[PDB]
Design a protein around this ligand. Structure first.
Ligand SMILES: *[C@@H]1O[C@H](CO)[C@@H](O[C@@H]2O[C@H](CO)[C@@H](O)[C@H](O)[C@H]2NC(C)=O)[C@H](O)[C@H]1NC(C)=O
Ligand SMILES: *[C@@H]1O[C@H](CO)[C@@H](O[C@@H]2O[C@H](CO)[C@@H](O)[C@H](O)[C@H]2NC(C)=O)[C@H](O)[C@H]1NC(C)=O
Ligand SMILES: *[C@@H]1O[C@H](CO)[C@@H](O[C@@H]2O[C@H](CO)[C@@H](O)[C@H](O)[C@H]2NC(C)=O)[C@H](O)[C@H]1NC(C)=O
Ligand SMILES: *[C@@H]1O[C@H](CO)[C@@H](O)[C@H](O)[C@H]1NC(C)=O
Ligand SMILES: *[C@@H]1O[C@H](CO)[C@@H](O)[C@H](O)[C@H]1NC(C)=O
Ligand SMILES: *[C@@H]1O[C@H](CO)[C@@H](O)[C@H](O)[C@H]1NC(C)=O
Lengths: 176, 324, 323, 175, 323, 176
């Protein structure tokens, strides 16, 4: 994908996460589990719903064919009528098909972007208090209980609260 | 020791729904929405409770002129749309032409009900023969007959006096008036039927100023007849009158049609007939009952319908690329 | 604490909004409206050239010379023509104008006529040329008739066979108009033209016409059960038009030389002159705008923006504005 | 937004930056202040101007309606004419509205991308000589005066010139 | 200094440029032109089938057999027809061709005619069949006439009533042509046809025609004040056409059996045969291309690219090329 | 570009890389050289080919003009015919030109995204075993021979094999 998250540095999706499009999997001393990110999921839902409705509403004023009849000495205007109606039908079929193709591409890339942005949100919260594993996961340099995990998920992680413990752990690792 | 971990991920399921993009076809996604209706019931139904006028083996001309094989439609109730076959066998039983026929059908597309009214009684022709104008080309129950809404007048006692007749539209609705002229096979037939050799039919309203003259020619037999009937029509407005004058070949009106309800109609071309159903959207191939915004059944629809496209598939991606 | 540098973006107090596929009413710092929605409600000159505003007269009433249309006996060059939806001054004597819509379409490509007398009204020495008036065509309470044609009547109980020719010696095309009278009954036919069986033959290099009067009883329109049926042709340079008739002839007197051709139109509007000038005119009013689109009316003339049915068209130029 | 910068990890815009769309806010011993990024702002201006002009010019040859009239027995071709003109008007209204929607979305995302690219420009200039604060700001590990700030702004920051001071500061912090 | 690995992208010396919404003339490493802009400027055979190139003859001059159009007395199967904008050999004797454009439209779906004699010129025993010639239709300096119809003249001061029929016993549709002469005056009417009051009646299963000559004085075209008015019909298999006339009859001799129907067209072009072959033809020349688009001419025939009014259509395939 | 790689933090392209659109340049004790990344280049080739074919096929059902003729008293329908055919020709010319513009922009940005994604793939393989130079290059903290380089190029770089050597080098540099 354009944003390198879905099927990128995050190789695959989670069948275990059913209540959302994007989210987290945490693992600490108290256990492990999935938790869908409500805010990004709802923003994506709103975006996709508005997209579908906008496509449908932009096809509100498409050409509607009308039956007209002509006699045997009106072949020129009968052919003109046929070509006019067929032409408009082809134009609007092209519009529908092309819009669906283009917006499908944009929708897939939109999900990719949302995943990447959620990952970067967590990354910029944690900074050097955690290590980037390269697969979508962060390995904390400090103990991160369920309340810590929730502070990460809702965007209220307190870096200075754990910075000293993380520094001690980082120095221990770097010193071998 | 390995520390605690938090991972960012995305939904996956066992969906096999696929979508297309510009750069990639058949992308499996976790969620998708089909927006193309592709199914119909294959029946002609009522349109919001209003039954259509299904002409079966009769054409619009056979109905309006009263082809004696079209007695099923001598008095039809209000309709929602009209259904006509591609080549109805009951049309102009006596061969000929219907002037401005397609313009009349176009007018019909905006009419929902006629009321037939007698404007000139068949029994009011005291100086002409009014009950001999029948032909084997227009059979009814094995007998020679003719279009029922017009009268083929013939000379009486070897004379055809000049007809001068008027009808004033005292109704409040527009009136569809039909008449015709007989083009005979030769001058001998002209004398035999109408006595007078040089004839005309003058027709006048506030807007119509017409004078028809018979065209004698040698023609191929159609439905056993080499003569021709050519029919003409007009819309007579309320309080306007139509005046006829003729010394021969006059196919006079008897019944006209009051336009009692105007609305959105159409003449649908279909070989199907009544299906004893109701629908909100009708196509010549069948009715549509759908919430899809698009359909590909047929471009000519009537009612509350989705938008027609020629596509075989229209699927919007809503979810994300599904991991296998 | 060390020194800091921060990356940021513009914000202001703009309330301009734009729409996208996924989100409506997005406030942006900068936007550009590209839809013109205003007009002056007037009919103006088009780049200094005044339109022909027919007021209560139709094109037929003008060209045939309906005596209630004397305002347009000699019109100067025009930029476009304005006609009402239902002009009251049309065919004062009832009837039909043959190929009328084709003539109006031709007019849409003409900017100026020069009237020329092709057959002087005083040149009818064997027929009555000043008795063809009707109460259906009043002028100041008097019975009158279309001014550009002559309703010829028998003279001393005789209507000799008319044979007249006009050769277009001009360098421009000539619009020639004539007509035929369809009377009520044979008595009126005899009273007006003496001859009971009449015709009008008209010929050019391309026209080969023979009209026959239709005597019949019709509903009265403007008090008349008779009808006038009018015909026209374009006589090309060095071609001649020949008329022959023994009755019912509505003869030409004035024809119209086509002296200037160009891109014009017949605009349908109930408005009248607004004493203004513009580069873009619509039936509802003139447009003075630099925007690329407008939604005033699809039928425009001049240097105009492109018409769309949109109620709003705003392009985002700035960024999403932070509250 | 698609690129996560505008209204993303950079919470809000700056009312104080008026002379450009994107730029910097610096703070050192000599003071603090705003400075618009000349190059990226000019690039965005050129892009948006070209976009508007391209849309307008692509609407140069759209359908122009023409008045045609028909008599009472030409209702079929009159209806054909009306449907033809209305059809083309609907096609071009759709074209205009849809192009505006799509390009508005792309324009907002374009600004987002420009902000993100400017941020990454600074980030990849500084590397480990500064610490990423996570809100769009970098805290230098070395003293960075106004000329240093300008070297960052114009893209000529000299990493080896300050790398040793930054390394010492990082070692002091790590201890 | 440690080992290094760098990530980079392709660059070359390509100068190919593409356009985008926000930037024009973007140099790219790879691009694909999709617009064909060249043609050979010739009219060629279409997949081995030679076109019918009428040169100085019109469709009417061909079908009626204008004696200046003997090159097309018997044409083989064609792929498309080429007609000049204003062919000089049209209706040599002036007049009109009824429903001419509807006939040309029918011709657009026909690829081959077989001429058939339906009424032998030698079968006119009671009329003069070899005197109907005019100086308006010269052939090799002598007065002549359209070859596929016969201008019948009275014989020994008599014009008996013609009653002739042709039954289409073939399996194909038959294009049948006939006409009527509108003379200049009654003296000419008597001179040519004796009978003063004449008609032509024509009947098939669908056709019900009765023509009456219009005698009038008209402008001379090709030296003639009279006019010839031509009519046509499609006679279906097993149907018959019946003619009756006591004067002014321009009788059929040859009709056209429609032996092959298919996709054809009447192309307007001043070019003529180029002794070449092609898969795609335009009025300006042939196209030999694998491009999906072309800008040569909108009216094409064959396996052609799609026409656009664009002057350039280049798709970017590679990346932005660094200078 | 939208993704900041092409003509961004990677200043320019490589004339020396001829066998691919994207790739690597390595330099170690055994020498230096270019190597095109087959996987990303082939993916881009497939994408661009499908795009071109999709555009062409979406212009498959465009309006085809037909010659019709009218006499001197059919000017209204002649004009209707001319305007209808010109209208459809203009509609399809607009469709072609606009689609080409939009997809050209998307193609350039697609190449940009592919370059950025390849860079991030290498970056997330190496993690702190190499130093990000900021110009598209990584300077290893450990010796990386041709087998190591090829493991980086094919996506099989084994971080734990070099993690201790890299940590020793990083500690030596940070300590002075
Ligand atoms: C038909 O009859 C009605 C009355 O039964 C006539 O009504 C008149 O209509 C004219 C307009 O055409 C009015 O000017 C009169 O005032 C009406 N009179 C009345 C008493 O209603 C009508 O004229 C008749 N139609 C025709 C064609 O003569
Ligand atoms: C109308 O008058 C002009 C003369 O002004 C005629 O033009 C002549 O036409 C003949 C051809 O028949 C030429 O040989 C002459 O040279 C023309 N004369 C001039 C002065 O140019 C024209 O023929 C007349 N039209 C009709 C229908 O009779
Ligand atoms: C033209 O001639 C053919 C052949 O003689 C006629 O075809 C016959 O038509 C009748 C019915 O009308 C059939 O019973 C015969 O079997 C047909 N014969 C053949 C050989 O097909 C045809 O009727 C004639 N057309 C006209 C108008 O007289
Ligand atoms: C996509 O899948 C369908 C079957 O669901 C198949 O018919 C079609 O050929 C496939 N298209 C491509 C491009 O592989
Ligand atoms: C692009 O280059 C062409 C020459 O190939 C030039 O004519 C045109 O003006 C250029 N367009 C722009 C926007 O600079
Ligand atoms: C024209 O087409 C023929 C057959 O496809 C081919 O042999 C010839 O090379 C083509 N001409 C050109 C100029 O490509």
């Amino acid at each position: 994908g354009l944003f390198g998250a879905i099927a990128g540095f995050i190789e695959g999706g989670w069948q275990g996460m059913v209540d959302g499009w994007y989210g987290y999997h945490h693992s600490n001393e108290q256990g492990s589990g999935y938790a869908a990110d409500k805010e990004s999921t709802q923003k994506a839902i709103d975006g996709v719903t508005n997209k579908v409705n906008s496509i449908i509403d932009k096809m509100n004023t498409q050409f509607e064919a009308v039956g007209r009849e002509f006699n045997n000495l009106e072949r020129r205007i009968e052919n003109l009528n046929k070509k006019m109606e067929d032409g408009f039908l082809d134009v609007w079929t092209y519009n529908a098909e092309l819009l669906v193709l283009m917006e499908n591409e944009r929708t897939l890339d939109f999900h990719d972007s949302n995943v990447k942005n959620l990952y970067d949100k967590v990354r910029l919260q944690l900074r050097d208090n955690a290590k980037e594993l390269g697969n979508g996961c962060f390995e904390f340099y400090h103990k991160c209980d369920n309340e810590c995990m929730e502070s990460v998920r809702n965007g209220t992680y307190d870096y200075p609260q754990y910075s000293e413990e993380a520094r001690l752990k980082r120095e221990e690792i770097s010193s071998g | 020791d390995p520390g605690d971990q938090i991972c960012i991920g995305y939904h996956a399921n066992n969906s096999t729904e696929q979508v297309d993009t510009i750069m990639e076809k058949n992308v499996t996604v976790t969620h998708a929405q089909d927006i193309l209706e592709k199914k119909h019931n294959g029946k002609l139904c009522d349109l919001d409770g209003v039954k259509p006028l299904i002409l079966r083996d009769c054409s619009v001309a056979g109905w309006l002129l009263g082809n004696p094989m079209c007695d099923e439609f001598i008095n039809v109730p209000e309709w929602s749309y009209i259904v006509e076959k591609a080549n109805p066998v009951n049309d102009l039983c006596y061969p000929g032409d219907f002037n401005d026929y397609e313009e009349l059908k176009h007018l019909l597309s905006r009419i929902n009900h006629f009321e037939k009214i007698q404007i000139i009684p068949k029994s009011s022709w005291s100086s002409h023969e009014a009950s001999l104008g029948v032909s084997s080309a227009c059979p009814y129950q094995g007998k020679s007959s003719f279009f029922r809404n017009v009268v083929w007048l013939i000379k009486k006692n070897s004379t055809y006096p000049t007809i001068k007749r008027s009808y004033n539209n005292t109704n409040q609705e527009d009136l569809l008036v039909l008449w015709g002229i007989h083009h005979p096979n030769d001058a001998a037939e002209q004398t035999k039927l109408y006595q007078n050799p040089t004839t005309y039919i003058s027709v006048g309203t506030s807007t119509l100023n017409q004078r028809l003259v018979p065209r004698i020619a040698t023609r191929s037999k159609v439905n056993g007849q080499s003569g021709r009937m050519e029919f003409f029509w007009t819309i007579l407005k309320p309080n306007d009158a139509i005046n006829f004058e003729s010394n021969g070949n006059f196919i006079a009106p008897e019944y006209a049609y009051k336009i009692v309800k105007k609305g959105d109609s159409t003449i649908m071309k279909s070989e199907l007939e009544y299906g004893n159903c109701n629908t909100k959207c009708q196509t010549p191939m069948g009715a549509i009952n759908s919430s899809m915004p698009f359909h590909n059944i047929h471009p000519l629809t009537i009612g509350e319908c989705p938008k027609y496209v020629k596509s075989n598939r229209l699927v919007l991606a809503t979810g994300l690329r599904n991991s296998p």
